[PDB]
Design a protein around this ligand. Structure first.
Ligand code: K
Ligand code: K
Ligand code: K
Ligand code: K
Ligand code: K
Ligand code: K
Ligand code: K
Ligand code: K
Ligand code: K
Ligand code: K
Ligand code: MG
Ligand code: MG
Ligand code: MG
Ligand code: MG
Ligand code: MG
Ligand code: MG
Ligand code: MG
Ligand code: MG
Ligand code: MG
Ligand code: MG
Ligand code: MG
Ligand code: MG
Ligand code: ZN
Lengths: 147, 174, 38, 206, 59
RNA sequence: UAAACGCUGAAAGCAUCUAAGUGUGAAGCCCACCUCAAGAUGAGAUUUCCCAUUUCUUUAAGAAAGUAAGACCCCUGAGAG
RNA sequence: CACCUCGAUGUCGGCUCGUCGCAUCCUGGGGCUGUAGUCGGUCCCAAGGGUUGGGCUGUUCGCCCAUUAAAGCGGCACGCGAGCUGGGUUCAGAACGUCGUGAGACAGUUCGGUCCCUAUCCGUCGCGGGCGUUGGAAAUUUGAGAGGAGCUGUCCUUAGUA
């Protein structure tokens, strides 16, 4: 009958959640966060429309890295110049720029397309327990059972 | 045969203050504080202290022994402290201390000046015999090792800074 | 230091140990016996 | 310490003991502190300095308003100096050549003379090809790279616009300071064409 | 449809797989198209379906 | 930090650079020095300037038409090309 | 081996331009020594930079001369001919030795012998226009990120001391 519901851009209400990363493995935090950002947690999910909710990650500095990932997990990036390879350990990233650590983890898990990049913008990561988005009235999103 | 089980007594007037971690030991020589692991249980008597592990796992055996050793070191350091005796040997080697500064002439083109931390002190009973004396065994050993590394012993003639009494194999250089 | 695949004690004083996941042989008597697996 | 000036030219000076040294004459009419930047307002500490008073018809209402705080005429050049003691500077304060003393070691920043479109030989100092023996390869930039990448690696240097770059010469010596004429004589030669802007700063390496 | 049903089931305290297993136990033949439509539009009806599924699972 | 050397220290009464804990250590890695750099669509920040006009549609983040601060056309040029 | 290419994928050496690997030639750090010292030997870490000017030969290679801290080894279509050269190797001429009765040929030498292409696209080096950056303007700026640079001798002193 062609009656399947298709969500529209702007009709879906996007809420705001706060996710505390303290002692949560980086990947598991990122996986749940990516699902929320995509909107997989809401029945109105429509693949070709953005419907996910905004995420505020706090305490990024305390994200957990199991095993020796703190010193052996290496993030590479090539400047595109000959011999232009740079590396940084996950532990160093956590200490100095934890926002980058969480963002790279979640970028890997969102789709690599226009919609995916747009959804990524909805993420906000903060090392420490306080964020500047109180005006949006975000609500706590426990993930203890989701991981 | 187990360090972790072996009890530790409290000589003289040494006292111990407990806490979730950061066990503190105070006494005539001074104070110390170490963040002991939260898995080993510590029982205290009027003069006897014992440590207990939850099980016989590899990890608990290891940590039990180490924690008892560390606690015993705190007690003994606060009681009598620790001292490393170095005997620098050379035709013209000498040492002299100005306060917490130890200056060494051990053959280099320049004298070597070393500074003790507050918890350690340098004696220099003679210009060739130095003694690093402190409360923290780790710091005492570290400073003595640094002094020795200023000019570690050489085998052919025995010159250099040594730990007093340490064996120094000597090669019969021609 | 002898860095070789096969590290074995060379005299009764040689003691086999593991440091940072590497097999090593340490002899207080003869330093020539000092070995690392690599 | 720092100041802004104009590259007047080059000459030579006889020092004591009669040694002859080449010097660059840099004039610096007293600069003026136009604005003070702080961590509280801008997040970093610096002083904005203006130089070379400008005719009013050449200025804008926004620019005139900007310099009004300092109560001076419009300035042709404006630059921020960092690594200075803000407590010692305030809007409207003047900076003169006397800030430096003879024998000071300074870094001098300028904009190198422009050469325009130049070939690889001049622009990157590459080797020519042979000029005879049947050669048909004289002033060309060499191979672009190996076959395998199916492309040219970045930074394969070729012909292009040469000069006009910001260049800093380090550890120059302040040979003399003339407060009356607002002149600083700096041993050596410094980047830039005559009448161009020059920035003197206390040598960072020192 | 499967994805939307999964989201709705999670909100009702269930996974998609557990919901479908429970529905099969309870003899419910409503297909995934109708289930997804209920999840988006008739939340109460979907919740009632989920309750019967969970009861069948418990039994 | 590498190799290497440790200090304290048990597992394993000893021993032990290691497991916990702590340190030294290279022209190398990150800084340090020089230059580019907010199309860094994540498009940042600071100072200063202009001022809330008119007409018609419409509750429109409407349309067009004079402008302000300002910029450019055009013209004389070079330290630029 | 014969899987792409015979309705064409140009072959040695040199030049121009480099870039990468590390199994490191020099420089840096270190262990063992049959390491007295000065020199070394061997092994471990290390690819940041540097790592030559000639005689002979088409040469690569190699030998030699003279230097250097060192005169590294390899990959990139034995990198690089729509970037260059064309000395060598495969055209037509001619000759020697040799083989052939012969035309000719090499199991070999020798002298001479045409190297085309106006760059559409990507890529690379520079320079503009448009729009964006959410009122319109003029300046000054932070630095996510990126590039550059990175070498080393000899002498004096310490001390003719250890
Ligand atoms: K901008
Ligand atoms: K072919
Ligand atoms: K050696
Ligand atoms: K290198
Ligand atoms: K030649
Ligand atoms: K030749
Ligand atoms: K090469
Ligand atoms: K050609
Ligand atoms: K080609
Ligand atoms: K193309
Ligand atoms: Mg063997
Ligand atoms: Mg040349
Ligand atoms: Mg490709
Ligand atoms: Mg076949
Ligand atoms: Mg073809
Ligand atoms: Mg190696
Ligand atoms: Mg000749
Ligand atoms: Mg080739
Ligand atoms: Mg080609
Ligand atoms: Mg015949
Ligand atoms: Mg033949
Ligand atoms: Mg001829
Ligand atoms: Zn042995």
């Amino acid at each position: 009958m062609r009656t399947t519901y298709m969500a529209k851009a702007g009709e879906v209400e996007r809420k705001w959640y706060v996710v505390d990363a303290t002692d949560v493995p980086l990947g598991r935090l990122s996986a749940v966060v990516a699902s929320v950002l995509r909107g997989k947690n809401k029945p109105t999910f429509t693949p070709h429309v953005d419907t996910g909710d905004f995420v505020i990650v706090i305490n990024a500095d305390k994200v957990k890295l199991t095993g020796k990932k703190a010193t052996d997990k290496i993030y590479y990036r090539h400047s595109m110049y000959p011999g232009g390879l740079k590396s940084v350990t996950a532990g160093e990233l956590r200490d100095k720029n934890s926002r980058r650590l969480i963002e790279t983890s979640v970028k890997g898990m969102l789709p690599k397309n226009t919609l995916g990049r747009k959804q990524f913008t909805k993420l906000n990561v903060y090392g420490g327990a306080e964020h500047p988005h109180a005006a949006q009235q975000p609500e706590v999103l426990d993930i203890t059972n989701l991981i | 045969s187990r360090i972790g089980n072996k009890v530790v007594v409290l000589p003289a007037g040494v006292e111990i203050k407990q806490d979730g971690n950061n066990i503190t030991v105070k006494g005539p020589k001074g104070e110390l504080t170490r963040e002991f692991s939260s898995d080993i249980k510590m029982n205290i008597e009027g003069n006897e202290v014992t440590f207990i592990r939850p099980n016989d796992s590899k990890e608990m055996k290891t940590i039990h022994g180490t924690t008892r050793a560390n606690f015993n070191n705190m007690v003994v350091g606060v009681s009598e402290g620790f001292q490393k005796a170095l005997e620098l040997i050379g035709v013209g080697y000498r040492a002299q201390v100005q306060g917490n500064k130890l200056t060494l002439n051990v053959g280099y083109s320049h004298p070597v000046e070393m500074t003790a931390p507050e918890g350690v002190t340098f004696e220099v009973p003679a210009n060739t015999q130095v003694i690093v004396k402190g409360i923290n065994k780790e710091v005492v050993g570290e400073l003595a090792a640094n002094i020795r590394g200023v000019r570690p012993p050489e085998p052919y003639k025995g010159k250099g800074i040594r730990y007093v009494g340490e064996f120094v194999r000597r090669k019969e250089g021609k | 230091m002898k860095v070789r695949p096969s590290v074995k004690p060379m005299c009764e004083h040689c003691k086999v140990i593991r440091r940072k996941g590497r097999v090593m042989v340490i002899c207080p008597a003869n330093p020539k016996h000092k070995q690392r697996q690599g | 310490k720092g100041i802004l000036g104009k590259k007047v030219g080059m000459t030579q000076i006889f020092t004591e003991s009669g040694e002859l040294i080449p010097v660059t004459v840099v004039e610096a009419t007293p600069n003026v502190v136009l604005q003070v930047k702080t961590v509280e307002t801008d997040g970093y500490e610096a002083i904005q300095v203006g130089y070379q008073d400008k005719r009013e018809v050449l200025s804008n209402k926004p620019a005139k308003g900007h310099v009004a705080k300092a109560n001076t005429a419009p300035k042709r050049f404006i630059k921020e100096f960092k690594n200075v003691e803000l407590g010692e500077y305030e809007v409207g304060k003047e900076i003169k050549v006397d800030v430096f003393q003879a024998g000071d070691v300074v870094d001098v920043t300028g904009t190198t003379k422009g050469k325009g479109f130049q070939g690889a030989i001049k622009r990157h100092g590459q080797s020519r090809g042979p000029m005879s023996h049947g050669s048909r390869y004289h002033r060309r930039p060499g191979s672009m790279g190996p076959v395998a990448p199916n492309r040219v690696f970045k930074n394969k240097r070729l012909a292009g616009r040469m000069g006009g770059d910001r260049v800093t010469i380090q550890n120059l010596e302040v040979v003399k300071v003339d407060v009356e004429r607002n002149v600083i004589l700096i041993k050596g030669n410094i980047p830039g064409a005559k009448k161009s802007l020059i920035t003197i700063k206390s040598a960072v390496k020192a | 449809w499967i994805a939307r049903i999964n989201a709705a089931a999670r909100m009702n305290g269930l996974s998609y797989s557990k919901l479908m297993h429970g529905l099969k136990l309870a003899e419910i033949d409503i297909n995934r198209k109708m289930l997804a439509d209920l999840a988006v539009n008739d939340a109460a009806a979907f919740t009632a379906l989920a309750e019967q599924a969970k009861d069948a699972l418990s039994k």
